[PDB]
C-alpha cells in the first residue's frame, strides 16, 4: 500500500489548520463579558478534521473526517462536548491506524472497498430527537444530541429512497416538514435528482425522481410554499475521468447556471422547468419565497467564476486563490414562464459575502433580515502580513458578519478585529415572542494572535459589540455549517412567526 | 460567598500555565522519528490543573485539581487518554460550577465542610490492577488504568491505618511490597507518623506509629533491606496560625534537617533515631541502600535554603525565585551510632538538579544509574528572553535531563533545545533481560515556540539524541510525577535485576 505518513505535512494542515483531533469535554468555558442568562440550548457545528494523515499529498480541507462540537448553554454557563462521527471511513481507518479512503468522491482511489464513503463533515441538523451529520454524497449519520454518540447511517425507518441526502435540507416552520433532496441519487455520475420530504411524525411525504440536464453539483436548494428550486453549479462529473484517477468535479465554461423549478406537492419528474441563469457559481441560499404575483424571489450568494478554483476546466483554466467574490443576489423566477433564459440578478449589498442565515421562523416565507459572512479587502480590516503565514490554506476566509434589514436597507457590520477571522454565524430568537431577526448571533472566531478559538455572542440591537467572548484554550479548525437547538423548542426547531 | 471569577487571572495561569481543562482522547498521536516497536505499556503522569477559577487570588500551581494523562504505547503507535480525578473537591465544585475549597491544606478557609480535601495532583502509581492518585494530606483515590474512571477514595479493604498516604511510596522489587507512610497521620498539626506496608496479596504487613520531633513536612522517604528513613523539611505547621487564615507551612531556620531511621520490620515507635543533618531542604530521594558495613547510603536532592520560598519564616524571611539550587547529595547513616549530628553530605555531580529516577528493578538495593532533571544557567542553553514572558510562574523549571553512571562517573545530558523545558522523566527497561539503566527514557517537553507539549523518547545508549518526538496538538500544563506500567509486568512493576 502507499506509505501512511505519521505526521501532517502541506499547507492544508499548517498553522491554524493543523489537526488537533481531540474528542471529549471542556466544561465551564472561560467567559469575558456576560452570556445572557435567558439563552438556553446548544450550538452544534461540524469541522472537517482528518483523524489520520492522508496517503494522498495535499488532500483538500473538505475531505477531512466530520468532528462535531456542541456548545451547551444554561444560566450564563457554557460547556463544550466534541466527538468524531463514527463513519465507516473513521471506524475502518481507526482499526487499521492508517488512511484507506482516497481522493474526494473518487472510490477508484480507495485502498479498500467502502459501502459508505461519507466523512459526515458538511452540516449537523436536529430531526426528531437525533442529530443528522450530513454529506451530500451519502445518507445522514444519526447521533445522540446529549452525548454525540453515533447511532449509525440513517435511512428514516427504511423509507430513504435516495443513495444521497443534501447537506442543506430546509425545515418548514408552519408544516414542521423536513424538505430534502439528493443529486447523483443513483450513484457516481448519474443525473438523477430525488426530491423527498418527511412530515413531523417521520413519515415520508413527497418522493419525485427528476433528471438534471448535466451531472452538475447541486450543493444547496430553496423551498417556497408551492415550489422547490435546484440551482446547479457548473461543476460536472465524468465517471471515466474518475476511473483514470481524475477529479469527480471539473468546471464547464460552456453551460449556464441551471435553476430547476418543481411544484412542491404532487408533481412528476417531467413537471420540472430548467431555467438558465447567466453562467456563474451558485453559492448558499439565504431563503426563497413567492411574492404577491406568485413569482419566486431566490436570494443566494452568486459569483461570476469558479469559487472551487482547485477543480478547474478540462484545460486547467480557472481563477487563482482569493480572486473570485460572491455577492448577495436576487433571482426572479416564474414557473408559468416558457422563457428559459433568466435576466441578470439584482444585488442586495456590495460586500464579498457567503454563509447567509435568516430567522428560520420565516423560512420558505418572506424574510426581511439576513446575517452573512463578509471578506473586506479594504486595508487595515485584516492584518494579512500577520494572519496569512499562520492561517494555512484550503478554507474560506471571513473577517466580519453583516446584518441586512431588507426594508430599511440598513447594514450593521461586526468586525472581530485585524488578527481574527469568523465562521458561519447562528441566529437565536431572544424568546418565543421576539420580532423577526431580534435576539442573539453567535460566531466562532479564529484568533491568530493566541492561535486559539473564541465563541462571540452578539445582540442584534448592536451587532458591532460583543456581549460575551467565550475563550477556548484549544483551536477548533475552521468548520462548515452549524445550527442552534433551543431548549424551549420540543422538536428542536423554532415556532412559526 | 466571595465572588467566583469566570476566567483565569494572575501569573500562575498565564502563557503555558493557562489551564486547558480538557478530558477525553487523542488517538494516533503525530510522531517525528520512530517509536521502538518493542515498547508496550502506559506512561501515566499527573498535573495540577484548576477546573474552575479560584476565589483565592494567585492560588499556587500545587493546589490545582489532579488531571491524569495516559500515553498508551503498542507497535510504535501511541494514544493519549486524559481525565480529572473525581475527588470530593472536583465533584462538589463541578456541581456548584464554582470554587469552594480554599488555601493549600487550610480547611478553615473552605467555603463548605469537606470530608476529603485531596486534589490527588502529586503522583499516580500502579497497585494490584488500579491506579492510585496520591496527595500527602489524604488517602489515595483509586482509578481504572484503562479508562481513568475514578472508583473513589481508597482504604485498602478498610486496612488503611492513617488519615494520610505519602505521594512517594516505594515498591520493593524482591518482596513485591508497597512500602508507605503518612505524616500528620492523626490530623492537622499532629507529629504522628504512621509507617505501614502492603504485601503483593494486598494484606497490610507493617503498622508502626512514631512521633516526629517537630510537625515538619516529610514529602519523600527512603527504604533499604532493613531500614526506612524519614527526611524532614524544616517547614513546620501551627494549627493556631491556620485557624486565623495563615499558611499550613512556615520555614524554621533554627532546626536541623532531621533524618529519622527505623528498623523496617517488627519495630516500635521508640526504636526511631532522629539523626540531625545540617539545616537544609530535603528534596526527592533517588534511592537508599545498605553497603557492606550495613551503613545506609541515602542519595537525594538537597538545598541549603527554602526551595518553597513562598512559605517563608515567621518574619517573612526567605530566598527569592530561582536563587536556591538543589544538588545530588549522599548522606551516610549508621542506626547503631548514638552520635545524632551527621556530617555534611558528599555531592555526586555539580548540576542544579531534582526529580531523580533510578532503574526501579534495584530500588532499596545498590543502584549505579540515576536519571534526573537539571537547570543549567550556562548562557544559550535556555533562551530566557523568549521563554520567560510565555512561561507564567509557580512551577519548577528544567532545561535538560542527565544520566549519571555511578561507577564510571560519566554524565550524558539531554538538551531538548533553547525554547523547550522538561518534566520528570521515566525509565523503561529495554526488555526483561536488559542490564540496569539499559533501555528508553521518556520526558514531556513544553515547546514555548509552538505553545504545544511533546513527548520525547530517548535510548540510554545515547541520551543526547531523540529516537522519537510525539507532537501533541494541545498544551499539557507543567505536571509533577509520572510512572511506566510495562505490559510484560503482570503486577505492573518490573522484575528484580
Ligand atoms: Cl459512537
Ligand atoms: Cl469517574
Ligand atoms: Fe454548504
Ligand atoms: Fe514529589
Could you please report the per-residue DSSP string of A159-196? T---S---S--EE-TTT-PEEEEESSTTSTT--EEEEE
Backbone angles phi, psi at B328, to 5 degrees: -75, 95
Q: Report how far apart the first and last C-alpha atoms of chain A are (Å, whole number).
A: 57
Closest CA–CA distance from residue B131 to any residue of chain A (Å): 21
Q: Which three cell numbers stand for residue B469?
A: 518526538
Q: What count of residues does chain A have?
A: 497
Q: Which helix (H) or strand (E) holds A390?
A: helix A384-391
Which residue of B lies nearest to A15 if distances are taken between CA atoms?
B450
Distances (CA, A) of B13 to A450, B18, B119, B383, B461: 15, 4, 17, 21, 38
Is the dihedral angle over the CA atoms A342, A343, A349, A350 positive or is it negative?
positive
Integer CA distances (angstroms), A130 to A144, A178, B247, in order: 6, 13, 53
Of B24, B51, B52, the CB nearest to A23: B24
Sign of CA dihedral A188, A325, A439, A456: positive
Backbone angles phi, psi at A386, to 5 degrees: -85, -45
- What distance in angstroms lies between residue B449's CA and the mean position of ligand 1's atoms? 36
Q: Give the Å distance between the CA of A350 and the centre of ligand 3.
A: 22
- From CA B14, how far away is CA A473, in angstroms rounded? 12
Q: CB contacts < 8 Å between A and B, how many?
A: 76
Residue B430: burial class (beta carbons within 10 Å; 0-12, 13-18, 19+): middle
CA distance A20 to chain B (A): 5
**Strands, sheet with A141-143, edge to edge from the N-terminal-most edge strand:** A123-127, A130-134, A141-143, A150-153
Selected for mutation to probe chain B from A22, A37, A93, A96 (highest B CB count within 10 Å) is A22
Chain B residue whose CA is closest to A16: B473
C-beta atoms of A24 and B51 within 8 A: no
Residues of chain A positioned with their CB less than 8 A from the CB of B21: 26-28, 473
Ligand 3 centroid from CA A67, angstroms:
16
Of residues A27, A97, A471, nearest to B28 (C-beta): A97
Q: Distance, CA B143 to ligand 2 centroid (Å)?
A: 8
The answer to whether the beta carbons of residues B44 and B68 sit under 8 Å apart is yes
Find the CB nearest B24 among A25, A31, A51. Answer: A25
Phi, psi of B289 (to 5 degrees): -160, 155
Contact B259, B229 (CB under 8 A): yes
Write down the experimental method used for this entry.
Answer: X-ray
Closest chain A residue by Cα to residue B21: A26
For B470, which residue in chain A has the nearest alpha carbon?
A: A7
* Location of C-alpha cell 512514631: B210
Enumerate residues 6+ apart whose C-beta is below 8 A from A1.
A55, A98, A111
Choose among A47, A141, A137, A52: nearest CA to A90: A52
Nearest to B77 among A23, A97, A475 (CB): A97
Following DSSP, what letter does each residue of A197-264 receive, concatenated? Answer: EE-TTS-EEEEEEEE-SS-EE----EE-SSEEEEEPEEEE--HHHHHTT--S-EE-TTS-EEEEEEES
DSSP state letter for B341: B
Ligand 3 midpoint to CA A135 (Å): 9
**Contact assignment for A8 to B27 by CB distance below 8 Å:** no
Of B6, B25, B474, the CB nearest to A30: B6
* Cell representation of residue B107: 480547611
Nearest chain B residue to A474 by CA distance is B474
Q: How far is the CA of A192 from the centre of ligand 3 (A)?
A: 20
Is A28 in contact with B22 (Cβ distance < 8 A)? no
Give the A-side interface with B, CB within 8 Å. Answer: 6-8, 18-28, 30-32, 51-53, 77, 82, 94, 97, 451, 471, 473-475
- The CA distance from A11 to A390, in Å, is 10
CA–CA dist B398, B391 (Å, integer): 12
Distances (CA, A) of B60 to A358, B49, B170: 48, 11, 27
Q: Please state, in angstroms and rounded to a whole number, the distance separating the CA atoms of residues B495 and B497.
A: 6
Query: What residue spans of B220-288 are helical by DSSP H?
Result: 239-243
Domain membership of residue B247 as a residue range? 1-497
Q: Residue for cell digits 502507499?
A: A2
Residue at grid coordinates 492508517 = A98
The radius of gyration computed from the CA coordinates of chain A, to the nearest angstrom, equals 21
Asked if A375 contacts A398 with a C-beta cutoff of 8 angstroms, the reply is yes
> Ligand 3 centre from A124 Cα, in Å?
11
Chain A interface, best mutation among B5, B21, B22, B32, by max A CB count within 10 A: B22
The answer to whether A444 and A476 are in contact (CB under 8 A) is: yes
State whether A474 and B474 contact (CB < 8 Å): yes
Q: Find chain B residues with C-beta within 8 A of A471's C-beta.
A: 7
The minimum CA-CA distance between A91 and chain B, rounded to whole Å, is: 12
Return all residues near A97 (Cβ < 8 A) that are at least 6 apart.
Answer: A52, B28, B77
C-alpha–C-alpha distance, residues A336 and A273, integer Å: 9
Of A20, A30, A451, the CB nearest to B8: A30
CB neighbour list of residue B242: distance below 8 Å, 6 or more residues apart: B105, B106, B107, B108, B188, B189, B248
Return all residues near A346 (Cβ < 8 A) that are at least 6 apart.
A329, A330
Domain count, chain B: 1
Distance B86 CA to ligand 2 centre (A): 6
Amino acid at each position: 500500500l502507499p506509505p501512511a505518513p505519521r505526521y501532517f505535512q502541506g499547507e492544508n494542515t499548517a498553522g491554524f489548520m493543523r489537526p488537533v483531533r481531540f474528542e471529549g469535554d471542556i466544561t465551564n468555558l472561560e467567559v469575558v463579558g456576560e452570556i445572557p442568562k435567558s439563552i438556553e440550548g446548544t450550538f452544534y457545528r461540524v469541522m472537517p478534521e482528518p483523524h489520520l494523515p492522508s496517503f494522498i499529498p495535499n488532500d483538500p480541507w473538505f475531505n477531512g473526517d466530520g468532528n462535531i462540537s456542541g456548545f451547551y448553554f444554561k444560566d450564563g454557563h457554557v460547556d463544550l462536548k466534541q466527538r468524531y462521527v463514527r463513519t465507516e471511513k473513521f471506524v475502518r481507518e481507526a482499526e487499521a491506524r492508517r488512511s484507506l479512503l482516497g481522493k474526494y468522491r473518487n472510490r477508484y482511489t480507495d485502498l479498500v472497498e467502502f459501502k459508505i464513503r461519507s466523512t459526515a463533515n458538511t452540516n449537523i441538523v436536529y430531526w426528531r430527537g437525533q442529530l443528522l451529520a450530513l454529506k451530500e454524497d451519502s445518507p445522514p449519520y444519526a447521533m445522540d444530541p446529549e452525548t454525540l454518540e453515533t447511532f449509525g447511517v440513517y435511512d428514516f425507518d427504511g423509507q430513504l429512497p435516495s443513495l444521497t441526502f443534501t447537506a442543506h435540507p430546509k425545515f418548514d416552520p408552519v408544516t414542521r416538514e423536513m424538505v430534502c433532496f439528493g443529486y447523483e441519487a443513483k450513484g457516481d455520475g448519474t443525473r438523477d435528482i430525488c426530491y423527498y420530504s418527511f412530515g413531523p411524525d417521520g413519515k415520508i411525504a413527497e418522493t419525485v425522481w427528476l433528471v438534471s440536464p448535466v451531472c452538475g453539483m447541486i450543493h444547496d436548494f430553496a423551498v417556497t410554499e408551492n415550489f422547490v428550486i435546484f440551482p446547479i453549479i457548473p461543476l460536472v462529473c465524468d465517471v471515466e475521468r474518475m476511473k483514470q484517477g481524475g477529479d469527480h468535479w471539473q468546471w464547464d465554461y460552456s453551460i449556464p447556471m441551471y435553476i430547476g423549478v418543481l411544484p412542491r406537492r404532487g408533481a412528476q419528474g417531467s413537471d420540472v422547468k430548467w431555467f438558465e441563469a447567466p453562467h456563474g457559481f451558485a453559492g448558499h441560499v439565504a431563503n426563497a419565497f413567492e411574492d404577491d404575483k406568485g413569482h419566486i424571489q431566490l436570494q443566494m450568494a452568486y459569483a461570476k467564476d469558479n469559487v472551487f478554483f482547485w477543480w478547474p476546466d478540462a484545460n486547467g483554466k480557472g481563477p487563482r486563490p482569493g480572486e473570485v467574490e460572491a455577492h448577495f443576489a436576487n433571482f426572479v423566477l416564474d414557473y408559468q414562464s416558457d422563457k428559459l433564459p433568466l435576466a441578470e440578478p439584482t444585488y442586495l449589498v456590495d460586500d464579498d459575502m457567503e454563509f447567509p442565515r435568516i430567522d428560520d421562523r420565516v423560512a420558505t416565507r418572506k424574510h426581511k433580515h439576513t446575517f452573512f459572512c463578509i471578506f473586506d479587502r479594504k486595508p487595515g480590516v485584516t492584518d494579512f502580513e500577520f494572519v496569512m503565514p499562520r492561517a494555512g490554506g484550503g478554507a474560506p476566509m471571513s473577517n466580519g458578519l453583516a446584518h441586512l434589514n431588507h426594508e430599511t436597507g440598513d447594514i450593521q457590520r461586526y468586525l472581530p478585529g485585524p488578527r481574527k477571522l469568523t465562521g458561519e454565524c447562528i441566529f437565536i430568537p431572544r424568546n418565543s415572542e421576539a420580532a423577526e431577526g431580534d435576539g442573539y448571533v453567535m460566531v466562532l472566531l479564529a484568533n491568530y494572535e493566541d492561535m486559539c478559538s473564541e465563541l462571540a455572542v452578539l445582540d442584534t440591537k448592536d451587532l458591532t459589540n460583543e456581549v460575551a467572548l467565550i475563550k477556548l484554550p484549544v483551536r477548533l479548525r475552521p468548520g462548515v455549517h452549524g445550527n442552534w437547538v433551543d431548549k424551549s423548542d420540543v422538536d428542536g426547531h423554532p415556532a412559526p412567526l
